[PDB]
Amino acid sequence: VDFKMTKEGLVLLIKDYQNLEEVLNAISARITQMGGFFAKGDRISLMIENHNKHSQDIPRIVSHLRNLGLEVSQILVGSTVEGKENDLKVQSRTTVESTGKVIKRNIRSGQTVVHSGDVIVFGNVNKGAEILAGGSVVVFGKAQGNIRAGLNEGGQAVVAALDLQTSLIQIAGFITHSKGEENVPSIAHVKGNRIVIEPFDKVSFE
Amino acid sequence: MVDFKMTKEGLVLLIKDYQNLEEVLNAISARITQMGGFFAKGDRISLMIENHNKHSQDIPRIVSHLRNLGLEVSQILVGKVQSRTTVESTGKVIKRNIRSGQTVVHSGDVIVFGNVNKGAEILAGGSVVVFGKAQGNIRAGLNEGGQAVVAALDLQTSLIQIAGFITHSKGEENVPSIAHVKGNRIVIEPFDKVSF
């Protein structure tokens, strides 16, 4: 873990790791070393080596950063140059919205909501939108686009909406493209050993 | 001001009237200390607050302070004992119905994938979402404040409190509604026309 000043602005670089607990503590130690340099709303870009192996840790790293006063503006996929780590090779990026546990608006196409806890959206999640939540996700409206929950909580997390028309729903290590009935509040949860979707009135967890 | 007592109801933490919660929590911490190793981490106790109607919105923090100290509140006694309710010791996400005489107490948001029956109550430091029919009494924002919200698939509650505000009005039958603080009162509007 280390901060790099680049052409992309300030970037928190996290090298391939095995213990998330150490990364977070490294981030904290790294921040503390600056002696209160960051301002109330400062934004940073985030880059994790071997991202694919750590994608489910995104919500907790982004939240840990928020709990420290830093807003993650984008997630960068790429790597650093050998003898000039302040120069980045960005093969991909994704914007992150600055939101909290409760979102009182629509999550538009292109936007990505992140949170290590349960996310509650009082509005709709459009087709090109996405949610990465460590916990459960409830959209009090129409849910389209992708919703990935249980990224750090586990298979007990759930995904519900007043109209579960998602292109994809992930819950821990399970995925599915199935959708709920037209205008029928439904809940996507891990039952048996797959993600089952059933109306709110006929749900049966465990 | 604060003392434990063994009764036929089992261990009961008695909280005598107070003007400052911070003082109370400080007293519970000190009392816990006095009891020596009398208590085990799992230990469950009943809670009774004197002028209860005046400290209602403090339950989440008292219950939380006791929990963080190793004591689990199993029921809240009113009054010897006028009324009572079983505290549904659970998690942020409830996957069952909140039955009559049962009370859910949480410091943050509460999400119920079930219903909140008539004699049921929910004390939430944050927002409340009931993915089903909500009938009991829902008290939200007890910690976070006025920006907290209360929502249900069928908002037919006897009472709804949000921070210092209250209201007895309900939402249209079988219409996902949201109660929030707008203007300076609690407003209830369907999901498709909410304006925060």
Curated annotation (Swiss-Prot), chain A:
Family: Belongs to the MinC family.
UniProt KW Repeat keyword: no
Self-association and partners: Interacts with MinD and FtsZ.
SUPFAM superfamilies: Cell-division inhibitor MinC, C-terminal domain, Cell-division inhibitor MinC, N-terminal domain
Pfam families: MinC_C, MinC_N
Alphabetical UniProt keywords: Cell cycle, Cell division, Septation
Role according to the record: Cell division inhibitor that blocks the formation of polar Z ring septums. Rapidly oscillates between the poles of the cell to destabilize FtsZ filaments that have formed before they mature into polar Z rings. Prevents FtsZ polymerization.
Record has Cell cycle as a keyword: yes
Single GO biological process annotation from the record: regulation of cell division
Domain of life of the organism encoding this protein: Bacteria
Protein's UniProt name: Probable septum site-determining protein MinC
